[PDB]
Design a protein around this nucleic acid. Structure first.
Lengths: 276, 276
DNA sequence: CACGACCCGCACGTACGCAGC
DNA sequence: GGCTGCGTACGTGCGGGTCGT
């Protein structure tokens, strides 16, 4: 039971090994430009020759750039009492749009969001590792709809021991959306309605959507709502007339579905996406 | 006949072994482990080194610099690695040995699929195509799997920073995200106190444009045991919302670690009916 | 730190496939 | 076709490895 197991283990080792040999053959360009396949020995002599021709595997540059491509990460070092940025890597430029000179010498308190100073303060103290989340200024955003001509504060993830890598987590920063009960009562109205239908959100809340519907499409609205109740998580869209807060009938497509809890599977509400 | 074969073949094995161990000696690892090293792991490392340099150069005051590598690497709360168009680790920092117990020499060269939990294979083969990247997997931890969260970008080859899992407050909730327990400290940051949130579930409080994302995170939590949500908006009792990011685990009571991100934005207009 | 329990690596010896005076 | 330089593939035997009750 050990002779065959072992002869086949060794065969596996020969296929494997010679596969490393032939795989490395077309790596070192000496063997990939040559006419025919060389001697194994001479192959790996070429390999050590061309390998000698050149902190593990990667240089400081390649590991910096790899942190940057990886997750928008840049190194910085500040003081643990003052906040004086005594070092920053140049990766800050393709991360925040700050020149390296506006960041070197200044304070981290001065670079974060005014509200994000307290927590930042709670970082430069005592009474060892560190990791926190803080907004930072862009210059020349990732936390909410971009405001009208305001500065841009990203959400930087800071780790370190103060020596820190600050990395962006881009995959997290995200007509008008609403919620309803199974009777179609507005249980939520996103603010976009103000510019979408004109009302204020409280001016819809508590009320039924069929109230704002055209008397000729209301029955359709009810049958549809009952249907998305009866479709489970399946989506259903309907186009109807909506009486805005200015005396006008806007044609409005709204897709909606019921939100069934991923665990208990209960109806939380019905989500509407009301678009003109 | 064979005497010539005995000593001639022993000579060939001699030349062989000498080439192998000098090739090993030149590796970017210190003399300590590059000296006494496995014979096949030699060609693993060399192959992944040429593959990784090709990988890097085919794509787009004195102290804080001399230890650039160890500062970047030991500042991050995870390990950083680079794959290729096939899945082979073309690089991985030594620091992975901290969080998974895996040897850098052992992982450099092997297919990533070898060290990820099966059943989550086709997810990752999906994610490498087999431009941003962000997902949860399960990796062989020898300290029998860890929930590894990875973020990175895909260039033909992925590049990833990854971290492990076991101005903030903790909530205990059921599996359906029904708030069971809650710390008092929420009155620090939010309008309600641990009684007017307990009883109802998380979904009556998420901003209705995020409920999609939080739903997906609920799924991933459910199937893999751990999760981190995206930057979302938790509505306040009076109006608006505040930004939260939660590290959540199971095994069964969900614990929901809410990292605070911002103050109450847009506190006038009411969104939900729970704000009237 | 034992002990067969092995498993895995390693090299050894040899057997089969190709050049050529 | 003799037989030798030259090289890769096969199988097994040995010494250094890690578990387990």
């Amino acid at each position: 039971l050990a002779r065959e197991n072992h002869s086949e283990i060794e065969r596996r080792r020969r296929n494997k090994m010679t596969a490393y040999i032939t795989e490395l053959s077309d790596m070192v360009p000496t063997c990939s430009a040559l006419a025919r396949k060389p001697d194994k020995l001479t192959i790996l002599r070429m390999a050590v020759s061309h390998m000698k021709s050149l902190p593990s595997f990667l240089t400081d540059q390649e590991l910096k750039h790899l942190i940057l491509e990886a997750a928008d990460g840049f190194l910085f070092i500040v003081s643990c009492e003052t906040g004086r940025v005594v070092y920053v890597s140049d990766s800050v430029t393709p991360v925040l749009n700050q020149p390296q000179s506006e960041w070197f010498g200044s304070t981290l308190y001065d670079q974060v969001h005014p509200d994000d100073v307290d927590k930042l303060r709670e970082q430069l103290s005592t009474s060892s590792r560190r990791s926190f989340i803080c907004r930072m200024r862009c210059g020349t955003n990732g936390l909410g709809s971009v405001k009208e001509g305001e500065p841009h504060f990203v959400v930087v993830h800071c780790t370190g021991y103060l020596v820190a890598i600050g990395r962006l987590q881009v995959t997290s920063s995200p007509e008008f959306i609403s919620r309803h009960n199974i009777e179609g009562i507005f249980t939520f109205v996103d603010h976009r309605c103000v510019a979408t239908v004109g009302y204020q959100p409280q001016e819809l809340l508590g009320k039924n959507i069929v109230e704002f519907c055209h008397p000729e499409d209301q029955q359709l609205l009810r049958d549809s709502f009952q249907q998305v109740v009866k479709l489970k998580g399946q989506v259903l869209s309907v186009m109807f007339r909506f009486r805005s807060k200015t005396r006008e009938w806007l044609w409005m497509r709204t897709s909606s579905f019921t939100f069934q809890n991923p665990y208990s599977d209960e109806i939380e509400y019905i989500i509407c996406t009301n678009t003109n | 006949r064979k005497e010539k074969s005995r000593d001639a073949a022993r000579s060939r094995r001699g030349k062989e072994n000498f080439e192998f161990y000098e090739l090993a000696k030149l590796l970017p690892l210190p003399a300590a482990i590059t000296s006494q090293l496995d014979k096949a792991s030699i060609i693993r490392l060399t192959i992944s080194y040429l593959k990784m340099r090709d990988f890097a150069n085919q794509g787009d005051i004195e102290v804080f610099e001399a230890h650039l590598g160890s500062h970047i690497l030991q500042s991050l709360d995870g390990f950083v690695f680079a794959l290729n168009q096939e899945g082979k680790f073309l690089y991985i920092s030594e620091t992975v040995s901290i969080y998974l117990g895996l040897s850098q020499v052992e992982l450099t060269g092997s297919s990533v699929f070898d060290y990820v939990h099966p059943g989550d294979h086709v997810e990752m083969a999906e994610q490498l195509g087999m431009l941003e990247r962000s997902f949860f997997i399960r990796m062989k931890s020898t300290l029998g799997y860890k929930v590894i969260h990875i973020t990175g970008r895909l260039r033909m080859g992925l590049v990833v920073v990854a971290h492990a899992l076991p101005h903030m407050f903790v909530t205990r909730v059921n599996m359906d995200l029904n708030i069971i327990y809650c710390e008092n400290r929420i009155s620090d940051y939010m309008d309600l106190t641990p009684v007017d949130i307990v009883g109802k579930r998380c979904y009556h409080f998420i901003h209705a444009e995020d409920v999609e994302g939080i739903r997906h995170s609920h799924l991933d939590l459910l199937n893999k045991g751990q999760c981190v949500t995206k930057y979302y908006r938790w509505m306040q009792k009076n109006g608006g919302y505040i930004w939260i990011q939660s590290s959540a685990t199971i095994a069964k009571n969900i614990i929901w670690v809410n990292y605070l991100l911002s103050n109450p934005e847009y506190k006038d207009t009411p969104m939900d009916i729970a704000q009237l």
